[PDB]
């Protein structure tokens, strides 16, 4: 309903579930089955209040890898222009994808420390249903520091479970508090 | 270099060469679709002048069909918000893909009708693909049928082959009309 544009990047290694998460955040369902793809989340800013306003929040899923040549990272940097928020997606199974988030973030800070950064960040970990009943505690501590070094909210979910995206959820409140913060900081 | 954003839709039936054209407009080469895809064209506004300004022109390749139910056109209408220009792509081989441009354009302008396109201010560009696949017999006949296509829309026309890198090489008659459009898209918006 608003012609105000909001742009949120979705960064992460290939295979962590960026496509399944974006599909979950927009179409409110599960991904059944190249380049940069964009889906739109219709977010009601301050829903139910006297300041309610409908925004169209673009989720930009850029591909690639953090090991490519700087003549390919410089071409990938034109998509990082005019960013209002960044979602960093990592695989709770693949601990190497959580370290590469530190390189994705610097990739955006190199062609746009973390304490001078003003862009709201959100760290989302995937494949939580694949965690063990005794390794749950060990990996959660490794990601709590991940959300502290970025000064970001943390959310851990399974993209194949539709109860991660049910209304009222604690994953839906941290999500709406993030999209609200993205709109507040100069939408 | 400028954080000013430009948004151009590229609409057309599936298989007409939207992906091959966008790749040609950005990477200046030849391409050897689910949902909406975006590539970025680095356009130098007023190139060679003291007012030169670098814009990042987003080319939004929206998918789908104009025969789908209005419950799919309502989901596809969120991608049509805040558009600064529209490229309408048709296949010179498939005459049916040029008729569907009449419904692609209206899908964006509403959210057959000569006055709508005469009152339209969003710059339009009609690009016909697969021109190298026409023989030297009906080639002249089909070019006449598309001149009316670009007139009913009050749009510029370009006809090319996306697989030949000389169709969009610099200095071309297709490369100046292209910059005249990206300039017009920036002018009728920011200026």
From Swiss-Prot, chain A:
InterPro entries to which the protein is assigned, alphabetical: P-loop_NTPase
Entry keyword Electron transport: no
SUPFAM superfamilies on file: P-loop containing nucleoside triphosphate hydrolases
Small GTPase-like, as annotated region: 1-187
GO molecular function: GTP binding; protein homodimerization activity
Keywords: GTP-binding, Nucleotide-binding
Record CDD domains: RabL3
PROSITE patterns referenced in this protein's UniProt entry, alphabetically: RAB
Pfam families tied to this protein: Roc (PF08477)
Binding-site list for GTP: 15-20, 127-129, 158-159
PANTHER family: DRAB5-RELATED
Assigned protein family: Belongs to the small GTPase superfamily. Rab family.
UniProt function note: Required for KRAS signaling regulation and modulation of cell proliferation. Regulator of KRAS prenylation, and probably prenylation of other small GTPases. Required for lymphocyte development and function. Not required for myeloid cell development.
The protein's name: Rab-like protein 3
Originating organism: Mus musculus
Gene name tied to this protein: Rabl3
């Amino acid at each position: 309903a608003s012609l105000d544009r909001v742009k949120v990047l979705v960064l992460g290694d290939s295979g962590v579930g960026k496509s399944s998460l974006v599909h979950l955040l927009c179409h409110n369902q599960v991904l059944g089955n190249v380049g940069c793809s964009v889906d739109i989340r219709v977010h009601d800013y301050k829903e139910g209040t006297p300041e309610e306003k409908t925004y169209y929040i673009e989720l930009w899923d850029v591909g690639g890898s953090v090991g490519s040549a700087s003549s390919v990272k410089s071409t990938r940097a034109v998509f990082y222009n005019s960013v209002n928020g960044i979602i960093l997606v990592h695989d709770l199974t693949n601990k190497k994808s959580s370290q590469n988030l530190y390189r994705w973030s610097l990739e955006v800070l190199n062609r746009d420390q973390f304490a001078d950064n003003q862009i709201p960040l959100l760290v989302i970990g995937t494949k939580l249903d694949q965690i063990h009943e005794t390794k749950r505690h060990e990996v959660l501590i490794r990601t709590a520091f991940l959300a502290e070094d970025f000064n970001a909210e943390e959310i851990n979910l399974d993209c194949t479970n539709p109860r991660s995206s049910a209304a009222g959820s604690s994953n839906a409140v941290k999500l709406s508090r993030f999209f609200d913060k993205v709109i507040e900081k100069r939408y």
